[PDB]
Amino acid sequence: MTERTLKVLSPLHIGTGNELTPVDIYPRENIIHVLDTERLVNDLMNLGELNEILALLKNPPAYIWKGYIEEFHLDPSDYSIYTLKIHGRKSMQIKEFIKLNGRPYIPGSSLKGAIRTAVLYKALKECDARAVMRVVSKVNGDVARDIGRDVLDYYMSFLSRKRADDLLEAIVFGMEPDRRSKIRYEPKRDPMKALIVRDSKPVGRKHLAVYHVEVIGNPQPIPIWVEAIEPGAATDVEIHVDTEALRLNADYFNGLLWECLKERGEPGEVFEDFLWEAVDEFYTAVMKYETIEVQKFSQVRSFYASLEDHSGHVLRLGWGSGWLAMTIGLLLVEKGYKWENVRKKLGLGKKGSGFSREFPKTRRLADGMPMGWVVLE
C-alpha cells in the first residue's frame, strides 16, 4: 500500500518546544488571534521607537500590552485560532503545534517513534529460552540472562540523559560486538532502518484550535493551555517497508526482532505483517489498562468503550500520551516489587518520592477527552 490515510479521534498536540507569550496574543472575542510582532511592530512605527523595546522587555500588566494597539489602529493577526474551552486574566502560555509554513502537519519522526514502541513491546513478549541464543553469538553475557530468567526479569535487577533503555534496545534491535559494558546498540543492524514513514500532508487551519488541558490525580488540578488538532481531521500519510533492504541484510541483522520474523516465515517478507500486529497489541493493551483507573473526571470510559468497533490500526501520538503509552513499563506492571525498588532508584516525585502513585498519577486530558489518538488503516 501507499498513501495510507489517517484520522484523528482525540486532541493531538505535536510540540515544537515553543510557547506563545501574551504579547503575541490578543483575544478580541471567544476566538483568539496571533498578532504579527515583526510586521505589527514595523507597522506601528509610521505613527511612532524605543518605547516598544522598553515595554515588551518590561512585561507589565499581556492585556494592556496588546490592547494598546487598539488606539488608532487595528487588525494585525496571523493565524487566529479558536479557544474551544471555558478559559482565557491573560496569564497563559499557549504551547504551539509544529508548522512548516504556519500550516500544521504531522512529522514522520513522531509517527515512527510510536510504531517503534509498539514493535519493541511485541519483541519482549514472545522473546527467555530463545533470548539466550541471540546473545550466544559474540556477546557472552547471555549466561547472566539465563541464570536470571523474557530478558525482563534480569533487567529489573540489572539497573538495580537517562540511558536506561540502552541494553534493552541493544537486545531487541542491535547486538554489537563489544563495549566497556556488555553490549551496545549498532544503528547499522536494525530492521527498523527499512521502515520508511514520511511526513504527512498539511492538515489545515480549520482543524487547529487552542485547548485547556486539566491535570487530574491531585486534589488541586492544574490547567495547561495548548493548541491541538481537533478530533475529526483526516490527512494522508504513506508508510512502506523497503523489502529490498532486508534481503541484503539477512546475515547482518542480530537481534530479537529478527528472531521474531524467522518464525512467521520468510523474515524479509512478513516484517510488514508483523508490524501492524505489534501496533494493535501494544495500544489495545494500554487502551484496556486505562479502563481500570477511574480517577479521571464517567465520560472517559465512554470514549474507551467507543474506541472498539473502529476499523483500522489505533495508536497514540503526541503530548498527552502518558507514561503508560511511551514506555515498555506497561509490561513492567506485572513485576510489582521488582519494579518498585527500581522506580525509586531513578526517582519520580519532586518538590522525595511518590509512594502509591509513583508512575501513573498524572492524566492530561483536554475538555474531558483523553488526548492523542490517531487511527491509521
Binding site: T21, T37, N42, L56, L57, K58, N59
Partner: protein, 121 residues
C-alpha cells in the same frame, strides 16, 4: 563576588561606542562576562544570519533581544536583564554604522561570550 561582577558592569558600561579595543579587552571583558545556552540562539544564530546578509532586520534583532527578557518572569529576569545590559549599548550605536565593518568586533565579541560560557559552565 557580585561586586567584582559589578566592577565588570562598569566595563560593560565602559564600551559605549563600538571600538572598545582591538587588543585583549574584548576577551578580558568576555572572560569576566561568562564568569543558559538554549535561550539565546534566536540571537546567537541570528547574528550568524545577518553577517552574510539588513537594516530592517537589525530592528528585529533588537526586538527579539527584548522579547527574550519580556517572556521569562520570576527568577528568570536577573541574568537575563544583565546579558540584556551588555549587548544593546553596543547595538544602539550600530544602527547608523557600517555593516560589513564595525560589526565584526562585536560579532567576534558575541561569539567569545558563549565560548567561555561552556568552559566555565
Amino acid at each position: 563576588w557580585e561586586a567584582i561582577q559589578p566592577y565588570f558592569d562598569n566595563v560593560v558600561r565602559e564600551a559605549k561606542n563600538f571600538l572598545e579595543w582591538s587588543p585583549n579587552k574584548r576577551l578580558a571583558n568576555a572572560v569576566t562576562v561568562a564568569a543558559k545556552t538554549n535561550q539565546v540562539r534566536k540571537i546567537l544564530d541570528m547574528a550568524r544570519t545577518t553577517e552574510l546578509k539588513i537594516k530592517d532586520d537589525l530592528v528585529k534583532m533588537r526586538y527579539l533581544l527584548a522579547y527574550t527578557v519580556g517572556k521569562a518572569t520570576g527568577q528568570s529576569k536577573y541574568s537575563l536583564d544583565a546579558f540584556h545590559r551588555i549587548l544593546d549599548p553596543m547595538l544602539e550605536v550600530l544602527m547608523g554604522s557600517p555593516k560589513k565593518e564595525n560589526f565584526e568586533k562585536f560579532y567576534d565579541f558575541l561569539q567569545a561570550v558563549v565560548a567561555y560560557h561552556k568552559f566555565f559552565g
